[PDB]
């Protein structure tokens, strides 16, 4: 397609039509949308006008994990995330739990970790864009083995590609275990899909954790983090606490328009181990929000509930 407004529209429309995996699931007349938005695409619209029109066309999918990026802006369906409370405070975490890196916690590549005062282990993993190696995980889980239970905090972790979700999650199973399913498209039809393929988690070749685990989640946990949560919640010693995750997966499809802009969206449906879609969010085992009355005392309601669960 040529680089002009019509070519960028048609290419974007065709990518979604042939590769987006929720057109039938969400009952979308993408063909209606083509003929209606075609009428709004003209020669000589500015980049601002074209971006706004193509953005609204993608808003018709109502999917916070369909992303359009240009040099001036990024677009995505927004109610998705920001209808839910934040449920994470980084300044509170550092003042009341982590403290000073020089003495009060330890840093193993992407992981910040420490023993809290009640002998509960605590791991903060901000970003899957930060590397975590197998040596880092050996050191963390060995140091924390003295603790009575373990908290893994992946709130506000928007994903990333530096670390696979299975590298961490495999530290918490001693047996090969089915944790989910993935279908991929087999054709351009809106329901051209393979049979779902099982996703297995195999035990890590290194130190593994043999006590109870809480994983903390919120609506800004997504993409690879969603895959991590999905792995972890199947496992016998794991309880998830917090909010529904933000959904997505660690395997979005990305494509470039003639004009250099890029679109990201889901092409391969991901399911939990009972064949529920997970890309719209995973509900936690225990639903909790951070309470302002607790923040004013210096406490994180979710960490405190986790500590209390792991103490008994």
Count of other CB atoms within 10 angstroms of residue 97? 22
Element of type H or E holding 93: helix 90-93
Domains and CATH numbers, the chain: 5-82 (3.30.750.44), 90-250+269-311 (3.90.226.10)
Looking from the CA of 10 toward its CB, the CA atoms found within 13 Å total 8
Can you say whether the dihedral through the CA atoms of 90, 96, 98, 104 is positive or negative?
Answer: positive
d(CA 240, CA 236) in angstroms, rounded, equals: 12
> Nearest-CA neighbor of 121 among 102, 108, 134?
108
- What letter would DSSP give residue 145? G
Please indicate the experimental technique that yielded this structure: X-ray
Report CA-CA distances (Å) from 199 to 166, 178, 191, 209: 10, 6, 21, 21
Q: After what residue numbers is the chain broken, C–N > 2.5 angstroms? A: none
Name 103's Cβ contacts closer than 8 Å, sequence gap at least 6.
none
Q: Report whether 271 contacts 227 (CB < 8 A).
A: no
Give the burial class of 115: count Cβ atoms within 10 A of its Cβ; 0-12 exposed, 13-18 middle, 19 or more buried: middle
d(CA 249, CA 278): 8
* Pairwise CA distance, residues 213 & 237, whole Å: 6
Burial of 163 (0-12, 13-18, 19+ CB in 10 A): buried
CB atoms within 10 A of CB 294: 17
**Ramachandran assignment for 249, one of left (phi > 0), alpha (psi -120 to 50 degrees), beta (any other):** beta
Contacts of 27 (CB under 8 A, 6+ apart): none
User: CB atoms < 10 A from the CB of 188, how many?
Assistant: 10
Q: Are 245 and 217 in contact (CB under 8 A)?
A: yes
| CA distance linking residue 146 with residue 140, whole number of Å | 11
Question: What does the DSSP assignment read for 221-253?
Answer: -BTHHHHHHHHHHTSTTEEEEES---B--S--E
Exposure letters 131-162 (e unless 16+ CB within 10 A, then b) = ebeeebbbbbbebbeebebbbbbbbbbbbbee
E strands, the chain, are 67-69, 74-75, 106-108, 111-115, 120-125, 149-153, 177-182, 197-201, 212-217, 238-242, 253-256, 262-265, 270-272, 286-287
Residue 19's CB is within 10 A of a number of other CB atoms, namely 17
């Amino acid at each position: 397609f040529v680089n002009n407004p019509q070519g960028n529209f048609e290419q974007l429309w065709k990518i979604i039509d042939e590769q987006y995996c929720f057109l039938d699931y969400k009952q979308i007349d993408w063909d209606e949308i083509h003929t209606r938005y075609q009428k709004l695409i003209t020669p000589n619209m500015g980049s601002e006008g074209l971006f706004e029109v193509l953005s609204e066309m993608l808003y018709e999918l109502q999917d916070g994990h369909v992303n359009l990026a240009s040099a001036h802006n990024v677009s995505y369906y927004d109610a998705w995330y920001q209808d839910y409370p934040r449920n994470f405070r980084a300044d509170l975490l550092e003042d009341s739990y982590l403290g000073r890196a020089s003495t009060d916690y330890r840093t193993a590549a992407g992981l910040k970790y420490k023993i809290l005062k009640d002998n509960i282990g605590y791991i903060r993993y901000e970003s899957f864009a930060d590397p975590v190696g197998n040596g880092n995980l050996d050191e963390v889980l060995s140091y924390l083995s003295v603790c009575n239970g373990l908290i893994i905090d992946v709130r506000d972790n928007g994903g990333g590609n530096a670390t696979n979700s299975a590298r961490i999650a495999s530290r918490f199973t001693n047996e090969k275990i089915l944790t989910g399913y993935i279908s991929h498209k087999t054709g351009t039809g809106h329901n051209d899909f393979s049979k779902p393929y099982a996703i297995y988690l195999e035990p890590a070749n290194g130190v593994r954790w043999q006590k109870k685990v809480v994983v903390l989640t919120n609506r800004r946990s997504f993409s690879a983090t969603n895959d991590f949560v999905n792995h972890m919640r199947c496992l016998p010693n794991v309880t998830t606490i917090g909010d529904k995750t933000g959904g997505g997966s660690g395997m979005p499809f990305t494509s470039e328009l003639p004009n250099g802009w890029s679109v990201r969206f889901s092409a391969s449906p991901h399911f939990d181990a009972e064949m529920n879609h997970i890309e719209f969010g995973i509900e936690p085992d225990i639903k909790a929000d951070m309470l302002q009355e607790d923040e004013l005392r210096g406490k994180d309601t979710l960490i405190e509930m986790a500590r209390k669960l792991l103490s008994e």
